[PDB]
Amino acid sequence: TGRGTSSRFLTSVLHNGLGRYVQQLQRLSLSLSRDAPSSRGAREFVEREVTDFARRNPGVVVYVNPRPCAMPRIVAEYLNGAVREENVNSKSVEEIKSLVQKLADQSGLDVIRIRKPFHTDNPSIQGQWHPFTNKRTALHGLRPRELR
Amino acid sequence: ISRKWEKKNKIVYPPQLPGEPRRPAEIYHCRRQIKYSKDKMWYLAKMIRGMSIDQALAQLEFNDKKGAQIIKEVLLEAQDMAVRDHNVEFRSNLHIAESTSGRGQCLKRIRYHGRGRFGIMEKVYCHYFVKLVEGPPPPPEVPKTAVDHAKDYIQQLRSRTIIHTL
Amino acid sequence: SPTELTEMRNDLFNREKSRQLSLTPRTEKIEVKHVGKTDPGTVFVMNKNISTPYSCAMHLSEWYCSKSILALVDGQPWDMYKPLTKSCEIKFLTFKDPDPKEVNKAYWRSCAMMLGCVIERAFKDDYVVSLVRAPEVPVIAGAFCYDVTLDKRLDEWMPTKENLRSFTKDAHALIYRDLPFETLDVDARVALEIFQHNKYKVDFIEEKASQNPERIVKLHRIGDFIDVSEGPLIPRTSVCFQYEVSAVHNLNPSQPNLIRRFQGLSLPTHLRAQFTIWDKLVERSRKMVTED
Amino acid sequence: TEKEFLEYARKAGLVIPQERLERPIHLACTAGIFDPYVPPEGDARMSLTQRTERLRKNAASQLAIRKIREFDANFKTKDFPEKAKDIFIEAHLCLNNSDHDRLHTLVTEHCFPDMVWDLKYKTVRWGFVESLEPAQVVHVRCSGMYGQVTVRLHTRQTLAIYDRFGRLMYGQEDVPKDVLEYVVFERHLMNPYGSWRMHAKIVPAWAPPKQPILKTLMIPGPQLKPWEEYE
Amino acid sequence: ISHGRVYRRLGLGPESRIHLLRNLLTGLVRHERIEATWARADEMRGYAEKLIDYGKLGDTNERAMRMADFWLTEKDLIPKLFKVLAPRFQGQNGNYTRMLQIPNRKEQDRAKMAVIEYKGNYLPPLPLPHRDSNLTLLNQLLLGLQQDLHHNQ
Amino acid sequence: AAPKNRRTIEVNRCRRRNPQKLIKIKNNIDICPECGHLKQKHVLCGYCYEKVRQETTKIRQQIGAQEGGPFRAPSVETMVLYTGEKPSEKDQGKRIVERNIKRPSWFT
Amino acid sequence: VKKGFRAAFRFQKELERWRLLRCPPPPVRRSEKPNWDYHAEVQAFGSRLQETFSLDLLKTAFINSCYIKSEEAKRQSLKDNQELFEQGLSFSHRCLTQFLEDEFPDLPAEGTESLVSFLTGEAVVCHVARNLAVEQLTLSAEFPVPLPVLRQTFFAVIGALLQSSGPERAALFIRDFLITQMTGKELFEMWTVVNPMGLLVEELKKRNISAPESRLTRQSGSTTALPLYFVGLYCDRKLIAEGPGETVLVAEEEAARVALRKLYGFTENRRPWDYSKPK
RNA sequence: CACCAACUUCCUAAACUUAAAUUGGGUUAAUCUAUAACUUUAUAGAUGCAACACUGUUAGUAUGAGUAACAAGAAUUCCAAU
Ligand SMILES: [Mg+2]
Ligand SMILES: [Mg+2]
Ligand SMILES: [Mg+2]
Ligand SMILES: [Mg+2]
Ligand SMILES: [Mg+2]
Ligand SMILES: [Mg+2]
Ligand SMILES: [Mg+2]
Ligand SMILES: [Mg+2]
Ligand SMILES: [Mg+2]
Ligand SMILES: [Mg+2]
Ligand SMILES: [Mg+2]
Ligand SMILES: [Zn+2]
């Protein structure tokens, strides 16, 4: 699947930690049903957890739109423009709360094989090794067997 | 059965702005259920690809194959419905952009054999499609020069990176 | 600087064309009938002052475009790219016609014109090159001759074989570029302005204007190069396949101003010649041929 | 399908006797004009005027007008131009959007095929510039029962046709052109749901040539077999 | 392994090959313009000319008469060969027959064809190839060279 | 001998699209000077040739009517005359074939 | 013809992907899509950046002249951000210039201006602007928002930030976002100079230093088609800098590039910019 | 006078210690019914309830392969002809 899938390098959105850390999660939208067993767990989440989550993360606009529905759906929008939707059908409040916290912490970057664990824009401070390093020069720069 | 090459001839584009480049014309013509093999027909279709219509109507005329006459007929219908019903100013301002042959519906019959045995015979048909685009034939492919070949090798080396490390 | 001369002439040429086109408003259909042997009786409705004889060939087939060099409008030879003016009869002339007299002359003038373009830009900017004219010589003469005056500083220098070879390479480069000839009819007043610097060109313009009742003059442009044309020329340079500047001979009676006759040979793609035949004709062209 | 059947019966052979239709077909209009009014030479020179001539010619059409009163009683010759003007402008506008349904109501079954048939897979841009002169009723004729009304219309218009690919053929992007034409408006006096629609346009012999098409055309020559020879 | 074997292999064998050529030749000697597949027409061309050679010998010669019988199935043509074909060709010593390649057959067999005739026939002239006139560009240049050389000679 | 494995379309596409199996383009096509129809340089023009053969059939049909029998070939020279033409003195004693149509331009 | 409605339903969505993905629709502004309230999103924008904003001022920043004209025409058939744009751009240019001068006082004024223009260019500004959700909240007649309009809104945001919170907080925003982009980028990518050797001579004269001497420090496979030469400029027999190149001229030209950085202190091993200062 | 070498072992997070006839356990895909939910969901009741393999059955299409093999005596004035 590694050869059968795409890959990228470790990256950030806008150099998140260089200056001020900006929360990547932008918006969460949850649709619920008044009378539906499957959305019962999500109804508990709105009763108690949603208010706490909204204050804890004030950069995430939260939309709750109860409607006659068959599957509750959470749609996550990140600042880079990436969208992500996860089905919450018949999940308890504990599962949703844990699930939502993952969305807030993650960034919009694609979840695919990351080629290298590390990233540097200035890997070398003393100068990238080139073949002529550690090679002694000769008087007048005479190449081997040159008479001059 | 699926006749979509026939419908594409009816697409209507929106009017152009005063300085937009003049859109080249496209024509879509074909003939179905031809009593000929699709494999045999391909050689005729492949030959004409990338040629004008007065340069593809000359090579066909002196070919011995049966399909040469069949293709020539649909290269003359296309050359007439382009000038009358698709607004092509000049008959000699066309070129065969695409041309290929497709399988048709066949018939199953019995080919007899020598010991009370037999085999299944298929009477083969095919279709043949052509698109004509208004404009002189795009200039042919120019082989890569020795300098161009050398440049790619250098470009390939320049892209080299230190692998599996910081 | 010579670059300045080319630019102003080019600009003058464009202005003359622009006024002529703007001068003609709307589209007026004109009847033109095919009078040739094959495909007889075809009638084209064409746009006045905009349509060209090449368009007439385009309707018929690609063969006419490829193999037609000139057209007989009402019994007169007309350039293939020269716009039509009024209802007339059109006959296309190939090289292999039984009576190719007109085609041969058109090709003849054409080749010597491309020769003139090569010469002027071949010299170094330090020296001075001026084009006087090319005498009309019968095709039987065995080569086409363009007379070019040279700076006094070059009076003691004659081009060597290497110099002659260089000219053909430039000539072939023009042929490879495949630059169509542009046909323009210009009144003497404008023509004098474009070639006022060249006294000989001015005199030639006066002769052409005097001949006709009006002051109409024939101007042909090969890309950058602009010059007066004695007769209708070939539509394209690519029509030439074999080209060679045989030799250049100083004119003996040139005491006031030294003039050198530049003599060359060319054959169209249609009438290509074998290697051995080409050499013999090339050798003949080296002999200096006078104008009768 | 009948297209498949038509090939079958031609290959197989068949005696297809025609039948007397049990229910007659319904005709809401009749091709042509019962009495075509010959246009008068110099009608453009009249730059009242024709209306006075129409009054003299009304006596010829007086019988037709009376028939309209019997079945309509609201038709007015004086007020018809304005109503007719509305139909003409409204109908041509539909072309812009190619609203077939609107056209059917505005134009007759004879008029509709002419306007639309040649404009399939083609975009037509048409507007109405101010009319040069007021419209008048040239002539009216009733035969049967069908009543036909001819209206003189001189109005400035702008039209530009385009290909499927959006390229421009015929007309001009936007330039006012003065056009004088005679339009025939007819209604079915018998049908309760009938109304006045656009049937046909009379064309005079003294009409100037229309705008020439942009592209050049080849009128082909005779195709001759080896037997034949040209002359 | 068929080097120097001038003859072809036609028909059902050697004798059949002789009898198919006798039919094309008799048709030619009768009509003076006959069509056949290029291979068979070319095979006959040698036989067609040699009849005129025997015809030139004359009626009196026994060998000419005997040969003119085996090679003319219809017997109303021996008088013609001797009395009109032979007199025509007395001036010439060769090139009795003109052979040209007609386009391929439009039969679904698509075989190469040729039309063979006798020179000076009464039938409409064949559309022969025409070489370019001396006035053409290339042709005219050569003529100028010829004139120059003729003066030099 | 029977195949031991099915051959893949990639291998099949390599064999039947090889340059050796393609149609080689013809470079000897030209335009007939008289009629303008296409011809090969080393071959006669079918359109022009068809005119000659069509006239030949008509002339031969006329000859057949006159002779009226299998073994009636005349030893004397043949000749064809068209309407408006009379035999010359040099043409005396030559069979004459009469054609209603005028003398064709190609016929001399 | 099998039983059930569900199998068709899953496939109907499969048809949905095929049509949408093969023939995607034109982009539509997030406003037209569901789950949009303007005021709530504007509030989150300030909170996300952690900077307190004047909501009324921020609203005016997103407004653009083009949007107003389109709305008025529709009404026939609300104040622009121009003032904020002028203030925002003026402060940013001064702020960007001040930051660069302190970090690289030796760098010539021409070098600083090119960096200021680069960091204020559309490519840098728009890329940061888009990822900050400026475009989503932006009010423009034409969508997707053109870069020059989007760049104006980004400067308008800075102008609104300046008025609400003053210069000090506004200065942080430039450093936190605009200045970060230059990480990794070397001087000559941001600033384009075609005559480094010529400029190097000028700088040395300004420093009262003699013209450099170019010498071949190292050589590799010169005659081959892949030669490497190290060209090092020497002043008074002292190596000011070294450079690698495919040819001596390229090595000589590049060697000038190295020296100019040295003088200007843009060597990549320079002390990293201090983005982490609390003040 | 050592280095390399296997999830053996250690380490950050975890885990809690070994081919297959057979044997025990917890869940799940599809569809119908009850009662609901209402873009395709829930708890129960049910059953023709899940196939990369039986020289499986039916249909379709490849490969061998455009291959093996198949056919009309000649000319003309020409296919109810000489
Ligand atoms: Mg049996
Ligand atoms: Mg098979
Ligand atoms: Mg051999
Ligand atoms: Mg041999
Ligand atoms: Mg273990
Ligand atoms: Mg089962
Ligand atoms: Mg299966
Ligand atoms: Mg099975
Ligand atoms: Mg196959
Ligand atoms: Mg084989
Ligand atoms: Mg065989
Ligand atoms: Zn011909």
Short mmCIF file of N, CA and C in Angstrom, two decimals, chain B residues 22-132:
data_model
loop_
_atom_site.label_atom_id
_atom_site.label_comp_id
_atom_site.label_asym_id
_atom_site.label_seq_id
_atom_site.Cartn_x
_atom_site.Cartn_y
_atom_site.Cartn_z
N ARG B 22 -10.50 32.30 -32.90
CA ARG B 22 -11.60 31.63 -33.60
C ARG B 22 -11.54 30.13 -33.35
N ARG B 23 -12.58 29.59 -32.74
CA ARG B 23 -12.58 28.19 -32.34
C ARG B 23 -12.54 27.29 -33.58
N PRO B 24 -11.60 26.35 -33.66
CA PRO B 24 -11.61 25.42 -34.80
C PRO B 24 -12.83 24.50 -34.75
N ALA B 25 -13.34 24.17 -35.94
CA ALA B 25 -14.52 23.33 -36.04
C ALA B 25 -14.18 21.88 -35.77
N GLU B 26 -15.17 21.14 -35.26
CA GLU B 26 -15.07 19.70 -35.06
C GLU B 26 -16.29 19.02 -35.67
N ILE B 27 -16.06 17.87 -36.30
CA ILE B 27 -17.13 17.09 -36.91
C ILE B 27 -17.01 15.65 -36.42
N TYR B 28 -18.16 15.01 -36.23
CA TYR B 28 -18.23 13.66 -35.69
C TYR B 28 -19.09 12.81 -36.61
N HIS B 29 -18.46 11.89 -37.33
CA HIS B 29 -19.15 11.01 -38.26
C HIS B 29 -18.64 9.58 -38.09
N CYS B 30 -19.50 8.63 -38.42
CA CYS B 30 -19.18 7.22 -38.27
C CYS B 30 -20.15 6.39 -39.10
N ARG B 31 -19.81 5.12 -39.28
CA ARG B 31 -20.69 4.13 -39.88
C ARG B 31 -20.65 2.87 -39.03
N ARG B 32 -21.81 2.24 -38.86
CA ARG B 32 -21.97 1.11 -37.96
C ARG B 32 -22.21 -0.18 -38.74
N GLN B 33 -22.05 -1.30 -38.04
CA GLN B 33 -22.41 -2.62 -38.54
C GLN B 33 -21.79 -2.89 -39.91
N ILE B 34 -20.54 -2.50 -40.08
CA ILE B 34 -19.82 -2.77 -41.32
C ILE B 34 -19.39 -4.23 -41.34
N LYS B 35 -19.60 -4.90 -42.47
CA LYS B 35 -19.18 -6.29 -42.61
C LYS B 35 -17.68 -6.32 -42.85
N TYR B 36 -16.94 -6.16 -41.75
CA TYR B 36 -15.48 -6.19 -41.79
C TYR B 36 -14.98 -6.37 -40.37
N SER B 37 -13.76 -6.87 -40.25
CA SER B 37 -13.17 -7.10 -38.94
C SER B 37 -12.67 -5.79 -38.35
N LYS B 38 -12.83 -5.64 -37.03
CA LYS B 38 -12.31 -4.45 -36.38
C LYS B 38 -10.79 -4.44 -36.36
N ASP B 39 -10.17 -5.62 -36.30
CA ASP B 39 -8.72 -5.70 -36.35
C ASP B 39 -8.20 -5.32 -37.73
N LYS B 40 -8.84 -5.81 -38.78
CA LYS B 40 -8.44 -5.43 -40.13
C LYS B 40 -8.69 -3.95 -40.38
N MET B 41 -9.81 -3.42 -39.88
CA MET B 41 -10.14 -2.02 -40.12
C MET B 41 -9.18 -1.07 -39.43
N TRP B 42 -8.53 -1.50 -38.35
CA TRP B 42 -7.66 -0.58 -37.61
C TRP B 42 -6.50 -0.11 -38.46
N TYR B 43 -5.92 -1.01 -39.26
CA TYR B 43 -4.77 -0.63 -40.08
C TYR B 43 -5.12 0.51 -41.02
N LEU B 44 -6.33 0.49 -41.58
CA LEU B 44 -6.77 1.59 -42.43
C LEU B 44 -6.99 2.86 -41.62
N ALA B 45 -7.62 2.74 -40.46
CA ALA B 45 -7.86 3.90 -39.61
C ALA B 45 -6.55 4.49 -39.10
N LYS B 46 -5.62 3.64 -38.69
CA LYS B 46 -4.34 4.13 -38.18
C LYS B 46 -3.56 4.87 -39.25
N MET B 47 -3.61 4.39 -40.49
CA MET B 47 -2.85 5.01 -41.57
C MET B 47 -3.17 6.49 -41.70
N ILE B 48 -4.45 6.84 -41.75
CA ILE B 48 -4.84 8.21 -42.09
C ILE B 48 -4.64 9.19 -40.94
N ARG B 49 -4.59 8.71 -39.70
CA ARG B 49 -4.46 9.58 -38.54
C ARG B 49 -3.44 10.68 -38.76
N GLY B 50 -3.80 11.90 -38.37
CA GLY B 50 -2.86 13.01 -38.41
C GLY B 50 -2.56 13.51 -39.80
N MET B 51 -3.55 13.50 -40.69
CA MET B 51 -3.37 13.91 -42.08
C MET B 51 -4.52 14.83 -42.48
N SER B 52 -4.33 15.51 -43.60
CA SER B 52 -5.40 16.33 -44.16
C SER B 52 -6.42 15.43 -44.83
N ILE B 53 -7.50 16.03 -45.34
CA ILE B 53 -8.56 15.24 -45.95
C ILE B 53 -8.39 15.10 -47.46
N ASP B 54 -7.59 15.95 -48.09
CA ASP B 54 -7.17 15.75 -49.47
C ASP B 54 -5.85 15.00 -49.57
N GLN B 55 -5.21 14.72 -48.43
CA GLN B 55 -4.06 13.84 -48.37
C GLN B 55 -4.43 12.45 -47.86
N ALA B 56 -5.57 12.32 -47.19
CA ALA B 56 -6.09 11.02 -46.77
C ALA B 56 -7.08 10.44 -47.76
N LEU B 57 -7.63 11.25 -48.65
CA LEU B 57 -8.50 10.77 -49.72
C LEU B 57 -7.73 10.31 -50.94
N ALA B 58 -6.41 10.52 -50.96
CA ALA B 58 -5.54 10.05 -52.03
C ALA B 58 -4.85 8.74 -51.69
N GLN B 59 -4.36 8.60 -50.46
CA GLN B 59 -3.73 7.35 -50.05
C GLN B 59 -4.74 6.21 -50.04
N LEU B 60 -5.99 6.51 -49.66
CA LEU B 60 -7.01 5.47 -49.58
C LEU B 60 -7.36 4.92 -50.96
N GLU B 61 -7.40 5.79 -51.97
CA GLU B 61 -7.92 5.39 -53.27
C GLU B 61 -7.10 4.28 -53.91
N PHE B 62 -5.80 4.21 -53.61
CA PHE B 62 -4.91 3.25 -54.25
C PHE B 62 -4.55 2.09 -53.32
N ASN B 63 -5.33 1.88 -52.27
CA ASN B 63 -5.18 0.72 -51.41
C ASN B 63 -6.13 -0.38 -51.88
N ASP B 64 -5.66 -1.62 -51.82
CA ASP B 64 -6.45 -2.74 -52.32
C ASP B 64 -7.50 -3.21 -51.33
N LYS B 65 -7.37 -2.84 -50.06
CA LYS B 65 -8.23 -3.39 -49.03
C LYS B 65 -9.68 -2.94 -49.22
N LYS B 66 -10.61 -3.81 -48.84
CA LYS B 66 -12.02 -3.50 -48.99
C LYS B 66 -12.41 -2.29 -48.14
N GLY B 67 -11.88 -2.21 -46.92
CA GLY B 67 -12.22 -1.11 -46.03
C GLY B 67 -11.83 0.25 -46.56
N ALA B 68 -10.88 0.31 -47.50
CA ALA B 68 -10.43 1.59 -48.01
C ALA B 68 -11.58 2.36 -48.65
N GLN B 69 -12.42 1.67 -49.42
CA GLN B 69 -13.59 2.32 -50.01
C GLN B 69 -14.60 2.71 -48.94
N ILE B 70 -14.79 1.86 -47.93
CA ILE B 70 -15.76 2.16 -46.88
C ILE B 70 -15.34 3.41 -46.12
N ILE B 71 -14.07 3.48 -45.72
CA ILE B 71 -13.57 4.66 -45.02
C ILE B 71 -13.68 5.89 -45.91
N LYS B 72 -13.34 5.74 -47.19
CA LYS B 72 -13.38 6.88 -48.10
C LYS B 72 -14.78 7.48 -48.16
N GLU B 73 -15.81 6.64 -48.10
CA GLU B 73 -17.18 7.15 -48.14
C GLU B 73 -17.49 8.00 -46.91
N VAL B 74 -17.09 7.54 -45.73
CA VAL B 74 -17.33 8.31 -44.51
C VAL B 74 -16.34 9.45 -44.33
N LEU B 75 -15.31 9.52 -45.16
CA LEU B 75 -14.46 10.70 -45.22
C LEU B 75 -14.95 11.71 -46.25
N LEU B 76 -15.96 11.35 -47.04
CA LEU B 76 -16.61 12.28 -47.95
C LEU B 76 -17.94 12.78 -47.40
N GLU B 77 -18.66 11.94 -46.65
CA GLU B 77 -19.81 12.42 -45.90
C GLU B 77 -19.38 13.45 -44.86
N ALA B 78 -18.32 13.15 -44.12
CA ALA B 78 -17.79 14.10 -43.16
C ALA B 78 -17.34 15.39 -43.84
N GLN B 79 -16.78 15.27 -45.04
CA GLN B 79 -16.30 16.45 -45.76
C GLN B 79 -17.43 17.28 -46.34
N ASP B 80 -18.63 16.73 -46.45
CA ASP B 80 -19.79 17.46 -46.94
C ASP B 80 -20.65 18.03 -45.82
N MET B 81 -20.90 17.25 -44.77
CA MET B 81 -21.68 17.77 -43.65
C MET B 81 -20.91 18.80 -42.84
N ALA B 82 -19.60 18.91 -43.05
CA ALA B 82 -18.82 19.96 -42.40
C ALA B 82 -19.04 21.31 -43.06
N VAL B 83 -19.11 21.33 -44.40
CA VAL B 83 -19.23 22.59 -45.12
C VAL B 83 -20.66 23.11 -45.08
N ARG B 84 -21.65 22.22 -45.05
CA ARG B 84 -23.05 22.64 -45.13
C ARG B 84 -23.68 22.88 -43.77
N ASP B 85 -23.44 22.00 -42.80
CA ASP B 85 -24.15 22.03 -41.53
C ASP B 85 -23.26 22.30 -40.33
N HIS B 86 -21.97 22.57 -40.53
CA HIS B 86 -21.09 22.95 -39.43
C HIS B 86 -20.29 24.22 -39.73
N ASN B 87 -20.57 24.88 -40.85
CA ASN B 87 -19.94 26.16 -41.19
C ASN B 87 -18.42 26.04 -41.26
N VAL B 88 -17.96 25.23 -42.20
CA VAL B 88 -16.55 25.15 -42.56
C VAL B 88 -16.38 25.85 -43.90
N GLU B 89 -15.56 26.90 -43.92
CA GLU B 89 -15.48 27.75 -45.10
C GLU B 89 -14.88 27.01 -46.29
N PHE B 90 -13.80 26.26 -46.07
CA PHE B 90 -13.02 25.67 -47.15
C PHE B 90 -12.99 24.15 -47.00
N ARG B 91 -13.30 23.44 -48.09
CA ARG B 91 -13.20 21.99 -48.07
C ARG B 91 -11.78 21.54 -47.76
N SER B 92 -10.78 22.28 -48.25
CA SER B 92 -9.38 21.91 -48.10
C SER B 92 -8.75 22.51 -46.85
N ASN B 93 -9.55 22.75 -45.81
CA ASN B 93 -9.08 23.27 -44.53
C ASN B 93 -9.51 22.34 -43.40
N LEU B 94 -9.28 21.04 -43.59
CA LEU B 94 -9.65 20.03 -42.62
C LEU B 94 -8.50 19.05 -42.45
N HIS B 95 -8.55 18.29 -41.36
CA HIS B 95 -7.55 17.26 -41.11
C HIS B 95 -8.12 16.25 -40.13
N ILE B 96 -7.77 14.98 -40.35
CA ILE B 96 -8.31 13.87 -39.58
C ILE B 96 -7.70 13.87 -38.18
N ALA B 97 -8.43 14.41 -37.21
CA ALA B 97 -7.91 14.48 -35.85
C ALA B 97 -7.92 13.12 -35.16
N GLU B 98 -9.01 12.36 -35.32
CA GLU B 98 -9.10 11.04 -34.72
C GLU B 98 -9.79 10.08 -35.68
N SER B 99 -9.43 8.80 -35.58
CA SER B 99 -10.01 7.77 -36.42
C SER B 99 -9.71 6.38 -35.86
N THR B 100 -10.75 5.61 -35.56
CA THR B 100 -10.59 4.29 -34.98
C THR B 100 -11.81 3.44 -35.31
N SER B 101 -11.64 2.12 -35.20
CA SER B 101 -12.70 1.16 -35.48
C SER B 101 -13.08 0.42 -34.21
N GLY B 102 -14.38 0.18 -34.05
CA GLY B 102 -14.89 -0.52 -32.88
C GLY B 102 -15.70 -1.76 -33.22
N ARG B 103 -15.82 -2.67 -32.26
CA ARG B 103 -16.57 -3.90 -32.46
C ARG B 103 -18.05 -3.62 -32.66
N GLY B 104 -18.69 -4.45 -33.47
CA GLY B 104 -20.12 -4.41 -33.68
C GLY B 104 -20.80 -5.67 -33.16
N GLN B 105 -22.12 -5.69 -33.30
CA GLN B 105 -22.88 -6.89 -33.00
C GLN B 105 -22.63 -7.94 -34.07
N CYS B 106 -22.32 -9.16 -33.64
CA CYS B 106 -21.96 -10.24 -34.54
C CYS B 106 -23.04 -11.32 -34.54
N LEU B 107 -22.88 -12.28 -35.45
CA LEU B 107 -23.79 -13.40 -35.59
C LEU B 107 -23.02 -14.70 -35.38
N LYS B 108 -23.67 -15.67 -34.75
CA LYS B 108 -23.05 -16.94 -34.40
C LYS B 108 -23.56 -18.03 -35.32
N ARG B 109 -22.64 -18.73 -35.98
CA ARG B 109 -22.97 -19.78 -36.92
C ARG B 109 -22.03 -20.96 -36.70
N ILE B 110 -22.28 -22.05 -37.42
CA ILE B 110 -21.58 -23.31 -37.23
C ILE B 110 -20.63 -23.52 -38.40
N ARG B 111 -19.34 -23.64 -38.11
CA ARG B 111 -18.34 -24.05 -39.08
C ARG B 111 -18.10 -25.54 -38.93
N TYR B 112 -18.41 -26.31 -39.97
CA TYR B 112 -18.38 -27.76 -39.90
C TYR B 112 -16.96 -28.29 -39.92
N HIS B 113 -16.77 -29.48 -39.35
CA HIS B 113 -15.47 -30.14 -39.32
C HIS B 113 -15.59 -31.59 -39.78
N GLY B 114 -14.51 -32.36 -39.63
CA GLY B 114 -14.34 -33.57 -40.41
C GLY B 114 -14.73 -34.91 -39.80
N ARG B 115 -15.04 -34.97 -38.51
CA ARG B 115 -15.36 -36.25 -37.87
C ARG B 115 -16.69 -36.17 -37.13
N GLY B 116 -17.69 -35.55 -37.75
CA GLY B 116 -18.91 -35.27 -37.03
C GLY B 116 -18.76 -34.17 -36.01
N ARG B 117 -17.66 -33.43 -36.07
CA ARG B 117 -17.32 -32.38 -35.13
C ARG B 117 -17.54 -31.03 -35.80
N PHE B 118 -17.46 -29.97 -35.02
CA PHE B 118 -17.68 -28.63 -35.55
C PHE B 118 -17.00 -27.61 -34.66
N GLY B 119 -17.22 -26.34 -34.97
CA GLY B 119 -16.74 -25.24 -34.15
C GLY B 119 -17.66 -24.06 -34.35
N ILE B 120 -17.54 -23.09 -33.45
CA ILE B 120 -18.44 -21.94 -33.43
C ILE B 120 -17.83 -20.85 -34.30
N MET B 121 -18.56 -20.46 -35.34
CA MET B 121 -18.15 -19.38 -36.23
C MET B 121 -18.86 -18.10 -35.82
N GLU B 122 -18.15 -16.98 -35.92
CA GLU B 122 -18.71 -15.66 -35.67
C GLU B 122 -18.56 -14.83 -36.94
N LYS B 123 -19.69 -14.37 -37.48
CA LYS B 123 -19.66 -13.41 -38.57
C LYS B 123 -19.43 -12.03 -37.98
N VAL B 124 -18.33 -11.39 -38.36
CA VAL B 124 -17.80 -10.24 -37.63
C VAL B 124 -18.25 -8.96 -38.32
N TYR B 125 -18.67 -7.99 -37.51
CA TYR B 125 -18.95 -6.63 -37.95
C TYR B 125 -18.10 -5.66 -37.14
N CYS B 126 -18.17 -4.38 -37.49
CA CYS B 126 -17.42 -3.37 -36.77
C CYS B 126 -18.05 -2.01 -37.03
N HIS B 127 -17.62 -1.02 -36.24
CA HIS B 127 -17.92 0.38 -36.48
C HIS B 127 -16.63 1.12 -36.77
N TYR B 128 -16.76 2.31 -37.35
CA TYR B 128 -15.60 3.13 -37.69
C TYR B 128 -15.95 4.59 -37.43
N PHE B 129 -15.14 5.24 -36.60
CA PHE B 129 -15.38 6.61 -36.16
C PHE B 129 -14.28 7.51 -36.69
N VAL B 130 -14.64 8.74 -37.05
CA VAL B 130 -13.68 9.75 -37.50
C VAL B 130 -14.09 11.10 -36.93
N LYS B 131 -13.11 11.87 -36.48
CA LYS B 131 -13.30 13.28 -36.17
C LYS B 131 -12.44 14.11 -37.11
N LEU B 132 -13.02 15.17 -37.67
CA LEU B 132 -12.31 16.11 -38.52
C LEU B 132 -12.28 17.46 -37.84
#
